């Protein structure tokens, strides 16, 4: 009855309700329609408000009354949500019943800052050899995994997440990791493919998954990441740590412009509303490192991105790589070659530096990634040498054979001390000379051979946490 606290829709279409009244609406407080539907107020104007509707229009129509929910767009969060799947507004969908939470959390928070943060230390294990060893991911940071269609971005992240297994039930609480998987755009079957699959490895038991799958109106595919950020922020603000994956921010880019153009906010580049930066800066900047003096907690984020034929410098990618610290590039161009994960060095970095890689990798991996940084020339030459520096062949013999050790691949992660097992053997050229081909069986058998008799050598990394003078010899004996 009063346009003070309510208002009748003046127009609607394409999910942009030009509501009348709502004089007291705040600038972002989500609201309520007559068909019982949310939408938040985005364009507060002199004679209307322009609300963006969550979900398909149909029921929304000229006159529908709108009500106030005086609370900036906030979403549920807490421990309860662990082990479930919800849309991207909080509410569950895995039919597993309700998760009546009692600790909300808004999504428009501003990233901490200089003083709350400290230093990326206490790395996080993907379990993916090639990843960690080469590209080690530290905790509290943003690692960008760009990569074209069919290339492994979701699997790697899915392995990286599967790796926390043994951790989420063992001793050292601090040596754990909770997981938040954000699905943006994807077919809701691909999502059920993961929920079920992660459930197979019990992995879902310590994970939270959120979906903004195609059907869902553009705002949802938008608000989704900002919903997952908050999920983990529960941990990053409670000592506990977390791993969030924003599967396709790219698709969220495709999905953001939509919403803004319909509010008549002048487009700029490829329709992208200008604040396509503040779109993805604002978000990533929220996964930070927490200082003891503030909590010690953390949140690591790997934003997924869609590579258009190989271009990593497209607007949005620049927009995203220009932020994130460390970007793992996945190239479809390689893959089938067997070169999987297929990471391009020279166009992908860890950025945070050797702080992530523990002394172990700082011992072995120290040569691995930049041996290949300029090797991208020689491995891009040898194909035609003949009369050069006769023995320059070593820096070459060292890409091929190793490469076949550098090609992790399976639905299984090889813990840090196993990763300290097989690759090390190469960096310390012993397998070396031997024509590659069978190398695959070393990395395979060296373990079934290790967990069958060598149960102490791995134990010297849970004691000394590096390579022993001793086990150097020991390993060096089973390898030779």
């Amino acid at each position: 009855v009063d346009l003070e606290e309510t208002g009748r829709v003046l127009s609607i279409g394409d999910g942009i309700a030009r509501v009348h009244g709502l004089r007291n609406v705040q600038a972002e407080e989500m609201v309520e329609f007559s068909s019982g539907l949310k939408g938040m107020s985005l364009n507060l104007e002199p004679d209307n408000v322009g609300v963006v509707v969550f979900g398909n229009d149909k029921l929304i129509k000229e006159g529908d009354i709108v009500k106030r929910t005086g609370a900036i767009v906030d979403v549920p969060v807490g421990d309860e949500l662990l082990g479930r799947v919800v849309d991207a507004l909080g509410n569950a969908i895995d039919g597993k019943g309700p998760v009546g939470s009692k600790i909300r959390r808004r999504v428009g928070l501003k990233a901490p800052g200089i003083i709350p943060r400290i230093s990326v230390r206490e790395p996080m294990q993907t379990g993916i050899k090639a990843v960690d060893s080469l590209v080690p991911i530290g905790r509290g940071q943003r690692e960008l995994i760009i990569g074209d269609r069919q290339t492994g971005k979701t699997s790697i992240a899915i392995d990286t997440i599967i790796n926390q297994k043994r951790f989420n039930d063992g001793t050292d609480e601090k040596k754990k990791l909770y997981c938040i998987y954000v699905a943006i755009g994807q077919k809701r079957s691909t999502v059920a493919q993961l929920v079920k699959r992660l459930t197979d490895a019990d992995a879902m038991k310590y994970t939270i998954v959120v979906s903004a799958t195609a059907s869902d109106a553009a705002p949802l595919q938008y608000l989704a990441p900002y919903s997952g950020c908050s999920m983990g922020e529960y941990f990053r603000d409670n000592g506990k740590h977390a791993l969030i994956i924003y599967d396709d921010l790219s698709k969220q880019a495709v999905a953001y412009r939509q919403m803004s153009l319909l509010l008549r906010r002048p487009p700029g580049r490829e329709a992208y509303p200008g604040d396509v930066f503040y779109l993805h800066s604002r978000l990533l900047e929220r996964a930070a490192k927490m200082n003891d003096s503030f909590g010690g907690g953390s949140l690591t984020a790997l934003p997924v991105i869609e590579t258009q034929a190989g271009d990593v410098s497209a607007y949005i990618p620049t927009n995203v790589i220009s932020i994130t610290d460390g970007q793992i590039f996945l190239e479809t161009e390689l893959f089938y070659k067997g070169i999987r994960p297929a990471i391009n060095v020279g166009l992908s970095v860890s950025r945070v530096g050797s702080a992530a890689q523990t002394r172990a990798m700082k011992q072995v991996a120290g040569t691995m990634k930049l041996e290949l940084a300029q090797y991208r020339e020689v491995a891009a030459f040898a194909q035609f040498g003949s009369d050069l520096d006769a023995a320059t062949q070593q820096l070459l013999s060292r890409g091929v054979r190793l490469t076949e050790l550098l090609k992790q691949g399976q639905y299984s992660p090889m813990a840090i001390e196993e990763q300290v097992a097989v690759i090390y053997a190469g960096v310390r050229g012993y397998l070396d000379k031997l024509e590659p081909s069978k190398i695959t069986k070393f990395e395979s058998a060296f373990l079934s051979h290790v967990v069958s008799q060598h149960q102490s050598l791995l134990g010297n990394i849970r004691s000394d946490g590096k390579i022993s003078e001793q086990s150097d010899a020991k390993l060096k004996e089973i390898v030779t």
Binding site: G95, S211, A214, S215, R264, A271, Q308
Partner: protein, 471 residues
């Protein structure tokens, strides 16, 4: 139910501009998506409501011509979206974008009709079960495998082998299929729809006598407005839906170009009061392609093994049209135009033809390895073919492919109208021995193009005789 308020469900047309008719009701505003009936007509003109402009005026999208329409004509409110008759009583018949019968065989007597706009199946409805389904085609069946309920996607750059392939998949798959089938022809030629009709008669599939028909034909093409090409894909989907759900069966659905579902918006967007985007397009293409494709799926009640087709405007995969689509198709096949020169047919490319069903568990460890190995050799092959050696081969480094490229160039059935070459196929059967040889080296030496327009290794020596070289 379709029944309005105790106040006039009639509006009077206030604006006409090609495919957009604005209408103004006084006593009963019709929701978005509602099918409207234009009075004063000599036919059936339905205008789908699209927006609620205010000033008690809606905004519709014309389902057929807006010819002769007049500023004041009465428009009726049905009170429900465009609903087409769904049922077994639509099999063997041809419907149009509204359910009107266009195969001329009179009324489509049916128990009910379903709205063409229905809520897509929820999360707790989906099904992880990915049981395989064989086509017996080279790249298409082997390389990028297919599956039950899985979506097929053929990316063609305008006349590269997208629709030919589909008739073909009808050949091996449709006929032998148990369960019902559908074919929504969206956008594309009327010529084909006709032939496709009569071919489906010649081969019984559609029988005009008994009641032994399995396919259902929904059409809405080129000679029509975009409001029509916008929804024909929906209708031919609303069909396949009813069969899977309310009649628990594993259906098949054939969409001849499913992104016409978007040319549509690209022809109605701006003229609706919207701000353009990528290429001009629409700030909705994502949700569009989305909301639609998320219906053609399986569920706890039945499965829909579908086959679509997606066009490549200006030959640019860089179009957010073929592009955006990818994320939906459970197997890729980007037929290349630079490939048709090479004659390689289908023009499926040894790069951009993915699948979310190509793991050793379902395809084969042996098979998926040489696939990796076929595209492997192929990758450095794509480079070598020009890089290093500079076109002319020979050079040095003897360190197969040209062979395998001819292997997966199965000229098959639907391509007979060109050179008598026929149904080159057979379900995996003797791929073994054959293709593996090429790669490891075995049997690989036969004078190059001597093994070109054929597949099975058995025809290397069964042709060497045809074209012999010795003395």
């Amino acid at each position: 139910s379709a029944a309005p308020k105790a106040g006039t469900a009639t509006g009077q047309i206030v604006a006409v501009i090609g495919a957009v008719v604005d209408v103004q009701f006084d006593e009963g505003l019709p929701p978005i998506l509602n099918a409207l009936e234009v009075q004063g007509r000599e036919s059936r003109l339905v205008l789908e409501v699209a927006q609620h402009l205010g000033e008690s005026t809606v905004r519709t999208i014309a389902m057929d011509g807006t010819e002769g329409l007049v500023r004041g004509q009465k428009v009726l409110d049905s009170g429900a979206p465009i609903k087409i008759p769904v049922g077994p009583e639509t099999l063997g018949r041809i419907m149009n974008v509204i359910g009107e019968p266009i195969d001329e065989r009179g009324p489509i007597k049916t128990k009910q009709f379903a709205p063409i706009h229905a809520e897509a199946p929820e999360f707790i409805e989906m099904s992880v079960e990915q049981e395989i389904l064989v086509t017996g085609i080279k790249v298409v069946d082997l390389l990028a495998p297919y599956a039950k309920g899985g979506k097929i996607g053929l990316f063609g750059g305008a006349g590269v082998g997208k629709t030919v392939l589909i008739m073909e998949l009808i050949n091996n798959v449709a006929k032998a299929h148990g369960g019902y089938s559908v074919f929504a022809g969206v956008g594309e030629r009327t010529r084909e729809g006709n032939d496709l009709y009569h071919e489906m008669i010649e081969s019984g599939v559609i029988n005009l006598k008994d009641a032994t028909s399995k396919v259902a034909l929904v059409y809405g093409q080129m000679n029509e407005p975009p409001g029509a090409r916008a929804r024909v894909a929906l209708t031919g989907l609303t069909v396949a839906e009813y069969f899977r759900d309310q009649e628990g069966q594993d259906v098949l659905l054939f969409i001849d170009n499913i992104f016409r579902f978007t040319q549509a918006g690209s022809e109605v967007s701006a003229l609706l009061g919207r701000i353009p985007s990528a290429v001009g397009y629409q700030p909705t293409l994502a949700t569009d392609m989305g909301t639609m494709q998320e219906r053609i799926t399986t569920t706890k009640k039945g499965s829909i093994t579908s086959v679509q087709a997606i066009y490549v405007p200006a030959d640019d995969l860089t179009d957010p049209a073929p592009a955006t689509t990818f994320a939906h198709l459970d197997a890729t096949t980007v037929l290349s135009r630079a490939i048709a020169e090479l004659g390689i047919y289908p023009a499926v490319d040894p790069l951009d033809s993915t699948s979310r069903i190509m793991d050793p568990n379902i395809v084969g460890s042996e098979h998926y390895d040489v696939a990796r190995g076929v595209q492997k050799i192929l990758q450095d092959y794509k480079s070598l073919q020009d890089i290093i050696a500079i076109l002319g081969m020979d050079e040095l480094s003897e360190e197969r492919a040209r062979k395998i490229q001819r292997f997966l160039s199965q000229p098959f059935q639907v391509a007979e109208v060109f050179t008598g070459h026929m149904g080159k196929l057979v379900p995996l059967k003797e791929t073994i021995k054959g293709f593996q040889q090429i790669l490891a080296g075995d049997y690989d030496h036969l004078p190059e193009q001597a093994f070109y327009m054929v597949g099975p290794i058995e025809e290397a020596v069964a042709k060497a005789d045809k074209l012999a070289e010795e003395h």
